[PDB]
Amino acid sequence: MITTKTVNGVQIAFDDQGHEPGPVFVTLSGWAHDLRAYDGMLPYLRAAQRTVRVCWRGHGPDRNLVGDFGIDEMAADTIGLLDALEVDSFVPIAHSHGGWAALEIADRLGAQRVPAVMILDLIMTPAPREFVAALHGIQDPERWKEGRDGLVQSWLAGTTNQAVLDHVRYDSGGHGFDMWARAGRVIDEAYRTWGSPMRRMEALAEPCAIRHVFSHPKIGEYDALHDDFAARHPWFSYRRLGGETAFPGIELPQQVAAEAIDLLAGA
Numbered sequence: 001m002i003t004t005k006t007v008n009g010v011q012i013a014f015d016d017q018g019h020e021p022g023p024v025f026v027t028l029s030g031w032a033h034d035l036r037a038y039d040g041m042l043p044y045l046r047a048a049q050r051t052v053r054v055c056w057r058g059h060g061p062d063r064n065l066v067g068d069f070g071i072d073e074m075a076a077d078t079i080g081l082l083d084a085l086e087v088d089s090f091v092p093i094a095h096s097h098g099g100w101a102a103l104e105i106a107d108r109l110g111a112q113r114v115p116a117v118m119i120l121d122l123i124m125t126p127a128p129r130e131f132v133a134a135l136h137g138i139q140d141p142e143r144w145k146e147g148r149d150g151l152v153q154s155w156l157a158g159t160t161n162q163a164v165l166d167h168v169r170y171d172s173g174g175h176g177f178d179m180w181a182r183a184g185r186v187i188d189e190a191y192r193t194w195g196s197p198m199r200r201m202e203a204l205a206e207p208c209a210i211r212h213v214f215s216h217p218k219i220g221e222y223d224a225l226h227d228d229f230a231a232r233h234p235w236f237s238y239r240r241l242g243g244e245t246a247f248p249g250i251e252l253p254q255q256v257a258a259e260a261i262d263l264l265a266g267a
Ligand SMILES: CCCCCCCc1nc2ccccc2c(O)c1O
Pocket: 029, 030, 031, 032, 033, 095, 096, 097, 121, 135, 138, 151, 152, 167, 168, 172, 180, 183, 184, 187, 246
């Protein structure tokens, strides 16, 4: 199934499925996992649009350590892969903090090449202090494994969803302190630099259609924040789903895919 290309000097793994006209779906995972985060969604995406699933450098089948990198390379590697394939307009679907890279891509290319972006359960507020502590915990060589187990448990809550449990237990091996600390550094620095993903979207020279889909932060002020952002920004949209986990794409693939098709249809 899975293919590779050298882009910007590094091996980018991806797969490319589907041949239907219109924008191309481009899936982007969080840190420390790969395109298996979109196995559940893939049947539904690829039936609607050509779908290219993309891994970050160092995240493909080759798990050699690569040189330090951050959002800029994530964005440039991905753009360069799509250019090598001559993908014109496309819609990123990005999980969690992959969304920082997806917004950088939309910023670099403007709203005709990237007419929409979908983000899946990314903390839209400034970083909670509890979250900042985990991001520093994962940069400490002696207890990075604890910070991971701590974040993982949050994401899962009490779920009984097998897809999500297997993904985190069995399908995300092969990373360790190098990548989890990089994630810590890059994520922390994005919140410290931009304050929040919502401020980042507002710095967009020309915002494309951006939709946030999430289950996790409990219902309440978090939705009120989204209502207000949507009321001030017609390009922004959101949907709370009824899942237990911070992996809506894996837990509720059909619903998330349907939201992605709908976002594209509107743009
Ligand atoms: C285990 C399986 C991989 C899934 C994680 C990708 C999504 C994700 N990664 C993070 C990585 C480091 C720190 C915080 C993170 C976070 O808050 C996320 O939501």
